[PDB]
């Protein structure tokens, strides 16, 4: 007999094709997509709880650290730490999905932009994406002069929220 252990279910009618109908079935794909999403975070979320080995401290260092004053520690509340871990987890999700693609935005009206950045129609990748519009025929006859009320200004540089109040308050020149 045969079964798929992501779904945990046995196949009802065993043939080769019923397997392939289950192997590329919508239900089964959503399981195996979700199964590896759980094993991804679990290696990171279950952080290596290391084992400590405490040495018997010296007579010398015990006197040199006694004269040194005891520093204050900061412990947050349970309600506080449940929110701050909700934030810091959601922040690391953002740094995954940045993908800084300003450079594609800069060469928009150039003479080979269809052939290099559209990426349905390169050579290296182009045959593979057609399986799984802005065509390759585009030349520099259409849109001769870019600035004819068409172009958008460059989106300004991003900044950190936490340190949003380090910015100089006034601009040097008067913008419109």
């Amino acid at each position: 007999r045969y079964y798929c252990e992501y779904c945990h279910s046995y196949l009802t009618h065993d043939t080769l094709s019923v397997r392939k109908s289950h192997l590329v079935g919508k239900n089964h794909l959503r399981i195996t997509a979700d199964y590896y999403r759980n094993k991804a975070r679990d290696i990171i979320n279950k952080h290596n709880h290391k084992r400590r080995h405490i040495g018997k401290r010296g007579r010398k260092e015990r006197e040199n650290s006694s004269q040194n004053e005891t520093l204050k520690v900061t412990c947050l509340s349970n309600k506080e730490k449940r929110h701050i871990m909700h934030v810091k987890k959601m922040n690391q999700k953002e740094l995954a999905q940045t993908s800084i693609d300003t450079l594609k935005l800069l060469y928009d009206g150039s003479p080979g932009y269809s052939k290099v950045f559209v990426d349905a129609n390169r050579f290296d990748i182009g045959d593979l994406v057609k399986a799984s519009s802005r065509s390759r025929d585009e030349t520099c006859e259409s849109n001769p002069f870019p600035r004819l009320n068409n172009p958008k200004k460059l989106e300004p540089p991003k900044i950190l929220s936490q340190w949003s109040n380090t910015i100089p308050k006034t601009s040097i020149f008067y913008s419109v």
Partner: peptide
Amino acid sequence: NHMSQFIYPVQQQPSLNHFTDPNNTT
């Protein structure tokens, strides 16, 4: 997951005097 990492910077204007007009020629 309410707030975000980054914002575009907002900034105050310098009130438009003769010394800080970017179109000025004279």
